[PDB]
Amino acid sequence: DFSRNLYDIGEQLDSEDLASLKFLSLDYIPQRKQEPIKDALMLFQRLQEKRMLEESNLSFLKELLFRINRLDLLITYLNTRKEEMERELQTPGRAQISAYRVMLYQISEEVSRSELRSFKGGLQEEISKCKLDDDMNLLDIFIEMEKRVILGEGKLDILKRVCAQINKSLLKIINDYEE
């Protein structure tokens, strides 16, 4: 039953949703363990190995599904409404994902293709030249920035520069996260 439910939830996630989940799980699943994850069941089993996903602890899975805006999966397979998740994640202590990760994902969801071109253009001097090809999305650029300690919870200056050069709502997201 439980395994069939996890399999069915995995069958509803495409490669982009899977990339989103892997980015949201960077603070719990390291790079080496993340590399061979090509479907949702592998990430689910990696969470099971850390006991963050069991038949009596669906909290982190529900949080992951809520953060990627798959409310349909939450209501269908986990029997959870949007208001329930909103009330749960804003209670002190229950948030398992860091606000930094959520703000990075939200900024990635608000950047179109041309804005991504300009964002990649802005970072021409802080990333090696082969690692700035079209084959990367904004989350991979965020990961590569974190690897070079130019982006982080205390280092928002370069992100703020690029976003201010691009758009105002991104600066609003950054400043709303900061407070």
Binding site: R32, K33, E35, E49, R51, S128, K147
Partner: protein, 175 residues
């Protein structure tokens, strides 16, 4: 401790986790080279350095808490408190090396192998080997140690993994 627990743990681990266990136990059993993980656990028990708490710490270092719950019937906080109260079986140097290895994909590992190949020959023939194999070959060459991390720091810098250099710097700042 009993051979049933060792058998269960041996069957639960995969190849990467087995290699990590061997590397972590390289300090307790340094005079011998155990071929497999069952032999390693038997050696640790024969040396007396394998109580239930020691195997719990080993399962904690490989991040297999489901095995802590199923085999030893333990939780994360229990093993963490045990490590806070009792001495550690695995030194913090090995833990740092395992963390760095777990935070490197295939391309980063290959680039580190290349940069250190500048410092060493084809130590092991296989081109596709892990970070822990590289640190083992370096230890055999007396090139990396808890008090000589400058070379690993520089190589991690040259592959643009400054976060791992910061990990090493915090480790050195904990001494």
């Amino acid at each position: 401790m009993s051979a049933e627990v060792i058998h269960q743990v041996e069957e639960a681990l995969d190849t990467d986790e087995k290699e990590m266990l061997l590397f972590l136990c390289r300090d307790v059993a340094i005079d011998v080279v155990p071929p497999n993980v069952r032999d390693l656990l038997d050696i640790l028990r024969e040396r007396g350095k394998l109580s239930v708490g020691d195997l719990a710490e080993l399962l904690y270092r490989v991040r297999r808490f489901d095995l802590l719950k199923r085999i030893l019937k333990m939780d994360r906080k229990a093993v963490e408190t045990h490590l806070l109260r009792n001495p550690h079986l695995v030194s913090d140097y090995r833990v740092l090396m395992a963390e760095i290895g777990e935070d490197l994909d295939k391309s980063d590992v290959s680039s580190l192998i290349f940069l250190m190949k500048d410092y060493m020959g084809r130590g092991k023939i296989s081109k596709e080997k892990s970070f822990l194999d590289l640190v083992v070959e370096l230890e055999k060459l007396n090139l990396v140690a808890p008090d000589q991390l400058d070379l690993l720091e520089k190589c991690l810098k040259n592959i643009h993994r400054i976060d791992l250099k910061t990990k090493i710097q915090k480790y050195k700042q904990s001494v």
